[PDB]
Amino acid sequence: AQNPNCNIMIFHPTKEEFNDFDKYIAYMESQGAHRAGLAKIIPPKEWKARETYDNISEILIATPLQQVASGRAGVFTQYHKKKKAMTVGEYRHLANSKKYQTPPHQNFEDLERKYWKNRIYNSPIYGADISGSLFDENTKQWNLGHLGTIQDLLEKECGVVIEGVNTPYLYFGMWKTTFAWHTEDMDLYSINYLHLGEPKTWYVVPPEHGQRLERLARELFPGSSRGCGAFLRHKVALISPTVLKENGIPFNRITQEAGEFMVTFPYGYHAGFNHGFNCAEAINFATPRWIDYGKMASQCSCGEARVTFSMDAFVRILQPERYDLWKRGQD
Numbered sequence: 001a002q003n004p005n006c007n008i009m010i011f012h013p014t015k016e017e018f019n020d021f022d023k024y025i026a027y028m029e030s031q032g033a034h035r036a037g038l039a040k041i042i043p044p045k046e047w048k049a050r051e052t053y054d055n056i057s058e059i060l061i062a063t064p065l066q067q068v069a070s071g072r073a074g075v076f077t078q079y080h081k082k083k084k085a086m087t088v089g090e091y092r093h094l095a096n097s098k099k100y101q102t103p104p105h106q107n108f109e110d111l112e113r114k115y116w117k118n119r120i121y122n123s124p125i126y127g128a129d130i131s132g133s134l135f136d137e138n139t140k141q142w143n144l145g146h147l148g149t150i151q152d153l154l155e156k157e158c159g160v161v162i163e164g165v166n167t168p169y170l171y172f173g174m175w176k177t178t179f180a181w182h183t184e185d186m187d188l189y190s191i192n193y194l195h196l197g198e199p200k201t202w203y204v205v206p207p208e209h210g211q212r213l214e215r216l217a218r219e220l221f222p223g224s225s226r227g228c229g230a231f232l233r234h235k236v237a238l239i240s241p242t243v244l245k246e247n248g249i250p251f252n253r254i255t256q257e258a259g260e261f262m263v264t265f266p267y268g269y270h271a272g273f274n275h276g277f278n279c280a281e282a283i284n285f286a287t288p289r290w291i292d293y294g295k296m297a298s299q300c301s302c303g304e305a306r307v308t309f310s311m312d313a314f315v316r317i318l319q320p321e322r323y324d325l326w327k328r329g330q331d
């Protein structure tokens with residue numbers, strides 16, 4: 001068995017290997033990359049996502065989200081308070097202000113220490129989940145707006161034609177902006193490209209151990225657990241590496257820098273934080289190996305998780321027994 005300790009693997013494809021996206025994912029999996037839940041892909045030196053980032057300031061963040069924490073430093077939830085719209089140039093200035101800027105630090109490990117010590121005492125503002133793309137239309141390789149769609153994959157594997165679309169999302173971050181512990185909708189893959197700016201630190205639980213994280217989360221968030229049998233689908237809970245180590249939960253960590261891709265694999269729980277002003281692009285995707293994960297994915301039916309139009313078909317076809325209850329949660 002390849003990668004039996006579930007380490008995060010880092011890949012350096014050549015320009016020739018970068019042509020066929022599906023083939024390269026399948027290659028990475030042949031080497032055991034999925035066992036970690038997360039892999040890093042460094043593009044060939046010849047590749048670029050677009051020519052420059054000099055003209056992005058007029059992009060609108062219609063609903064910036066202030067991430068307010070509750071709990072203790074290593075075990076907290078966050079809620080998202082909606083703020084007034086602002087442009088990317090306005091948000092960059094805000095991120096660089098004395099109130100929000102990254103503190104002085106020695107290295108990524110010192111910054112990580114400062115994040116876990118201090119996160120809860122601040123409320124950073126995240127421009128998340130903005131439909132759109134920063135890939136140039138002429139970028140042919142690993143262009144996250146030109147991937148094969150999940151609807152087409154389901155149709156190729158299972159023969160059923162379904163409605164829905166699959167488009168990318170932009171994330172504009174600042175110091176301390178945080179992504180809570182989650183798997184993707186329907187336990188899909190994700191791919192995330194850090195277009196510019198400061199790094200993003202990731203934490204990940206191997207898919208084979210995801211239920212260990214769930215059981216810890218039910219213990220640490222006991223009211224939330226009573227409210228919903230899949231409350232990590234709400235995407236609000238944070239657990240620090242120190243707490244995970246104290247409770248014996250297997251995990252790994254890695255820092256993504258600008259110009260790098262990360263791939264999350266089906267049922268790989270992940271969480272993380274931004275180091276400073278940055279912009280990432282991410283999208284979900286599927287492969288043949290996902291289908292079994294999709295059929296087994298948990299679902300939130302309490303009403304909190306509320307998701308895209310396109311998840312309807314996935315539930316309806318892969319999980320017909322759950323469909324009625326889940327759809328009630330959506331309505």
Ligand SMILES: O=C(O)CNC(=O)C(=O)O
Nearest residue numbers: 171179190191192280282
């Ligand atoms: O970058 C972020 O805030 C969160 N991204 C992801 O969870 C991802 O790409 O799957």
Ligand SMILES: [Mg+2]
Nearest residue numbers: 056057058059
């Ligand atoms: Mg612009």
Ligand code: NI
Nearest residue numbers: 183184190264
């Ligand atoms: Ni994710």
Ligand SMILES: [Zn+2]
Nearest residue numbers: 228300302304
């Ligand atoms: Zn729920």
